Design a protein around this ligand. Sequence first.
Ligand SMILES: CC[n+]1c(-c2ccccc2)c2cc(N)ccc2c2ccc(N)cc21
Lengths: 197, 148, 724
Amino acid sequence: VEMAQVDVQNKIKAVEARLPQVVRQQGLQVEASSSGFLMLVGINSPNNQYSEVDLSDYLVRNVVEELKRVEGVGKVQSFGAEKAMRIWVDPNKLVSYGLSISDVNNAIRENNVEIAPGRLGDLPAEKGQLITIPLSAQGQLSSLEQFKNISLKSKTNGSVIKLSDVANVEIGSQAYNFAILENGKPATAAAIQLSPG
Amino acid sequence: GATAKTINDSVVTLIERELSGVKNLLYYSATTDTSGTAEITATFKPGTDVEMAQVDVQNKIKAVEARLPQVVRQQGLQVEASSSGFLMLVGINSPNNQYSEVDLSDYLVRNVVEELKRVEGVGKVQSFGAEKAMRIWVDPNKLVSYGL
Amino acid sequence: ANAVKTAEGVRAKIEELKLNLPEGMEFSIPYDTAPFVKISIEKVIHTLLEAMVLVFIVMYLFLHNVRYTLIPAIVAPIALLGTFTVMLLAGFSINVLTMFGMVLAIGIIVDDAIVVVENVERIMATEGLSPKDATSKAMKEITSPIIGITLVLAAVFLPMAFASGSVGVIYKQFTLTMSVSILFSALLALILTPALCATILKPIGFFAWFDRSFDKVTKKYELMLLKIIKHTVPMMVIFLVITGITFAGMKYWPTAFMPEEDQGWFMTSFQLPSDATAERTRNVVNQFENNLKDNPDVKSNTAILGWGFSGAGQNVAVAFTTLKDFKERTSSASKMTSDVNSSMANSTEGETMAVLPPAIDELGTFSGFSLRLQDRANLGMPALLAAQDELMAMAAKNKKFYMVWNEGLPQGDNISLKIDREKLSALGVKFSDVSDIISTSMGSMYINDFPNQGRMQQVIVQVEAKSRMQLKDILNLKVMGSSGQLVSLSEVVTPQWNKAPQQYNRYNGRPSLSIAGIPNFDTSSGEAMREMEQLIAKLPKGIGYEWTGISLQEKQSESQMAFLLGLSMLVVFLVLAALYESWAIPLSVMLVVPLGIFGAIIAIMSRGLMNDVFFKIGLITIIGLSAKNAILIVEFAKMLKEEGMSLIEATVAAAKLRLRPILMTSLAFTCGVIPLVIATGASSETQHALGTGVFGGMISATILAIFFVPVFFIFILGAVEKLF
Ligand SMILES: CC[n+]1c(-c2ccccc2)c2cc(N)ccc2c2ccc(N)cc21
């Protein structure tokens, strides 16, 4: 299986360029079919206090690796939705201010950015330099309020408006295609594959 | 473009999650410093085929290339066989200071390193010198005056 | 890849590249480890030759004739050649372990031929028979014992080749190189030796004295044995006492993995504070070079500034120090490292560690114990570092360790600039501009390539050094506002100073810290590991530990000793039961293992040597050899018993007749290992470890067995007769 998978990946690498840009950005996932299924581990919320995304987040953060380090446990496949920062834009509010989707995307790409850290005193250094110290800056946004406070410029009047005004920002799922129900309530699951031998 | 903490939380842990689970693995470890590079090492049981181990590792690490940061993705994740120590050190020096360290380091890189690396049985040649380059030292206070 | 051949190719290539070298440039090879391999190989070959010569001399001292001595001696080179063929077929390579196995087997592989020739000579002398009739009678008498001894000594080494880990690989070399050689020696003894005895043996001072003295000693041995057989229960009690002492010594004696060897070079690591610069590290490296200057025992010193084996940066350095030849040297590498550490400790602003090369090439980069302290309860990095500091505090006050330190970059200062986005919006500044001016302020940007003298070379744009040395220069950077005036970063960014780690390490997917330590002299690796475990047990909850590198292999080797010994003993017992069709005859032969382990442990205690893998291999060899010395008497005693003689009479006659072969065989093996015992020079530690235990065990088995195995036989057979 390993020698088939490596050959397949090497042959796929040839046409990676001609593929559509979004497919490249998402990435092509290559795997080998496994038959060592052992069991399923799931978490459910009887009181609906949590959603599927929250349960999946808890499972991946605090459960999957715990099960992985148990003797005889090999691969763990978590089924669910990964959390993401979802912005839902109202076209009427956007046109009210003479703004478009591209403007919102540009604002997000601008305000949320990574700043390259550096070192003061790095080589080549001025003679007599004694102290060398790292220096870093934070440009990324890590909170809902920060994303909601992003500033856009209205073309109609030139006033400064907030992203929350033209859109609703929340924490949701990267994809909403699938849902998992445990006895009619939100749930998440992970399949444990037995290690060979 | 990241600190040690960011690389640890973005690259090392994400990859090491999938590394756990290869065949005939004794243990795995990871190290990250402020040099912008991260090194993970997987140790396999004695009497194990290294060639099979490399392909297994490559298969298990290509399933996370998508989630890996863009810069690492374009630069690539490099898999290699491990050699702990140095077989030997080959040096060049100027008895009469005719050539400076930069010149010696340029000659070593551009005439010696590649020749040595092609000797049968040589796995890796690590040159502790740098090739010559065109350096542009920009004064921050000057270009701002001209608005650049 | 082969180290020796790769080094030869590198040295050849350098030779061709010398001609096209601009004047004023000279090549050098300050650090090279390949030669030591060939030096060790040639040393082990010399040891093998010395063992062969000593064994030949011992055989001559007994046989008194050159032809008689040659007849057995010829079997060893042929057996070794067959073993070489088997190694080539099986994929094994010539190395120190296989050659040491050959050296150990050189005494064994002559035992069968010695037994054949001794019986032939005895028959010719006593019965006045021709060489061909004497050979026929001798072989008819001794065919079975040779096969039994060969099978036992081949089977005894088999189990240790099935062990796991590196210790299994080590045992595999000895198992093959001993079992195959022993089988080939037995085949030669059964095939060629009778023909030579029948063909090249002619009919029949110091030698006369030796003969008369040996007859006198044989008479004294017979009388002493006759006296001894009367007292059996006391001699069972004494044997139980000896077994108890052997068990106590085996359990309560320090254990190790592999002796530390002098390879003619040591390593030095300089770790300086996080805020240190290249000049500061260069200063301490210059002090180290000056201190090592003028020392006659140093050939060449090379220092790599800015790189390390546990992290790279501006505050790290590594140096390789090569010592002169062993004959020209006057101080051991360990003393050199100790002096270097003592000198560097007093006057330096950082930590300098001088260490010796590891026991195995790729199993670590230093000799000592390596630990991984892990945060297993999500305690946090600062908690892990506090636990590290407390562990270092406990370890620095203990007499069980010499020096324990951390192999990683120190924790250090970090500056973080918090950007006031509200102020940026109010002033009209655009965030991306700030982001760009900060990112490129003190970083090197690779742009394009340009042709320099026929090679593409990089164009790198960076800010001048004078403007990236202090935080003020970065805070002086200005950006354009909406109103038009330039606003400096200091107005819009606030600096914050914090203490955070500069290196992040993980072991088995958990936050981890690497620790190294050197056990103090008079303390073994196992003792140091146990004490370190006890100290770690006192750390706060949520902190765990792991043993990595040499430590894990040593633990695994120590774990498997008892099972291997028991399985080997059971295999020998089963083989003996199969051969002699009894459950009591093997029982008597199985009681000599304590007699040899008593004496092996005694020798290692007297010489102050630890229980290591080579000691275990010697123990297995002594099990085999003691089983041989018991069999040599027990087989003939039993056979005489079926002929019609009584138990005591048959046993006494068998011991009297088989004294000479046993003494010859045992002395041949014992003298075959003296070169290892008294080895001096390079690699002498490994030879001593491999030889002292076997020397002591063989002596104890030879001296004690001749008086104990007859009593074991009589006691066990009498008990069997009484009960059933
Ligand atoms: C990711 C979709 N997907 C697949 C799947 C669909 C197509 C291709 C490969 C797997 C799946 C396949 C099998 N056998 C069993 C369970 C699931 C599953 C379960 C839950 C979920 N939320 C998505 C799930």
